[PDB]
């Protein structure tokens, strides 16, 4: 569980929740995925600001699977690790 | 080439190549936050918040002792950066 390792999920201007993705036919069986709490980002006054967006940061990771559902197959999956705040103006 | 959030984020980052011939994958791209603060509404680095790396625990392959035997090692990699504040709302 990443909640016990880091609390950036609660302190970020683009906070997130962690959801357990369970699969017995896959190794690791449990994968924790970040889901952005808001569409906007939290501003200085504590309000959800829609001049920016919370977006998930994804990582391509290889996983082990039992196929057909002796043999194992290495499968590529995309996982959300956390969220960042993006703006339409690049400085 | 897959995502440009590194340039559009209020906590932007650069990607650095971590090379290791005794590890598979040999090359791992790691995020390094560009600034200590975060980019505010006016385009300035704001030090009332901090850019922090989001790290992921990932398994890698290593040659141990340093051609026949390998070890599966859990490593920590920075995937990107987020902006944190000292006031939680």
């Amino acid at each position: 569980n990443p909640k016990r390792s880091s609390d950036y999920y609660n302190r970020s201007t683009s906070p997130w929740n962690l959801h357990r993705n369970e699969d017995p036919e896959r190794y690791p069986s449990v994968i924790w995925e970040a889901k952005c709490r808001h569409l906007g980002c939290i501003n200085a006054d504590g309000n959800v600001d829609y001049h920016m967006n919370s977006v998930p940061i994804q990582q391509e990771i290889l996983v082990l699977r039992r196929e057909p559902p002796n043999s194992f197959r290495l499968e590529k999956i995309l996982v959300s690790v956390g969220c960042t705040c993006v703006t339409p103006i690049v400085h | 080439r897959s995502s440009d959030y590194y340039n559009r984020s209020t906590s932007p980052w650069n990607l650095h190549r971590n090379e290791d011939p005794e590890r598979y994958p040999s090359v791992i791209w790691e995020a390094k936050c560009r600034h200590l603060g975060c980019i505010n509404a006016d385009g300035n680095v704001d030090y009332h918040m901090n850019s922090v790396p989001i790290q992921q625990e990932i398994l890698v392959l290593r040659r141990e002792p340093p051609p026949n035997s390998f070890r599966l090692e859990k490593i920590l990699v920075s995937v990107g950066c987020t902006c944190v504040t000292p006031i939680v709302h």
Partner: antibody
Amino acid sequence: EVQLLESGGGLVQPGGSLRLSCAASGFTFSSYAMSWVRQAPGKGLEWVSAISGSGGSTYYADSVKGRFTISRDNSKNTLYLQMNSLRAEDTAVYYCARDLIHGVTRNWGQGTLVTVSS
Amino acid sequence: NFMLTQPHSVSESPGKTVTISCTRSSGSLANYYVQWYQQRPGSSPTIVIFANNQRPSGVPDRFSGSIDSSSNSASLTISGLKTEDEADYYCQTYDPYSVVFGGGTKLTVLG
């Protein structure tokens, strides 16, 4: 250079279905929210639907709720719009649009004409 | 839901300054970015202004965007009006769910 190429338009009978595609190139597709906007001949621009970069969040105009489905294939750099229960009022040029954030469109495609008629 | 009201048409002589307004019916205008698009006959819309006042490269310095929170309206101003500025102009903004375009303004360059 940003390129958005729509396909799939043509004639549909009222009550029929049609799927539109938009092939994107020149930008990192999966990091952009995308939109569909339509325009009936000699009329104004009308927002239809939007989708987050990941595809995790979707948004619809009241006029198309339940009938249309926006989706994307990030491995194919393609945006789709599935339209069911089409009616004469859905006749329009449909544009694919790239958004910098939700609601801020930065680029438009060439459009594809959809005609709903018996 | 909300609406954006724009004038049906605006007119001015060459070299003059023209302003096109866009009034939001509900919700605070300053909470959400305003975009302006130009549409020429038989063409796709092109962006003139994004994020209230940002001008992309290729858009003349004559085009500028502004917002007025007191009146809950945004404006597209064209200084030194040219005949090539004849086109339809649309304002656009959003809320946390919807995206809305104004009805559009036909710009006529007089004389």
